[PDB]
Design a protein around this ligand. Sequence first.
Ligand SMILES: C[As](C)(=O)[O-]
Lengths: 116, 116
Amino acid sequence: ARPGGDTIFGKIIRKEIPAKIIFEDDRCLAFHDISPQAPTHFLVIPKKHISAISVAEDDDESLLGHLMIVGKKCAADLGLNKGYRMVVNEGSDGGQSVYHVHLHVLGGRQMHWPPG
Amino acid sequence: ARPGGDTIFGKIIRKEIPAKIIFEDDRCLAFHDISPQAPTHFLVIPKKHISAISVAEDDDESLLGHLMIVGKKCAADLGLNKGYRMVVNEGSDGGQSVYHVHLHVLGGRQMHWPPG
Ligand SMILES: C[As](C)(=O)[O-]
């Protein structure tokens, strides 16, 4: 139980591997996605290991909302004036991919509907 | 100003328009979207009128987390045990359809990448 958990996200948090870090505070970390689906695609993750949104606790409320505030602030810092889409994925149907909560922020192009 | 605001979502919050309500507390409402893009497709909106995520105050961090906590409990009470996708749309490039903050929860099918 190392601080930041046992996923590849734990390695980014403990600075064991480099990443394109846009923002860091004592609660979270935001960085550019390796496989960008939009001219701007970044991730906001908590430093606390929550394996899935499905198992977040009621008192993680503040932390989850902070991810969104940091997502919206980083979107403004990067010049996303025409808008953006935020995404949280759970499980197989969601395409969660990694067992650590993350918020996607995408913009720089028109996003379409449905959202996949 | 009136309780819940001057959008279509205000009318829902004051029970002027019908919605099938999944969940209600003093801070938010969850109900089925009437243009569903998945076998399950519901919204969680704050009872407080924030026009868009891009104009959310740091005073709104707790409420934003609350939307995602109620989002994941509703998904579980509706039986989305294979997963789901949570979306917030900001502005023109994000396809924001209503100027009142809303969380989409979609499930009951495989969601694809990219998410629009
Ligand atoms: C009917 As809608 C709020 O999913 O654009």
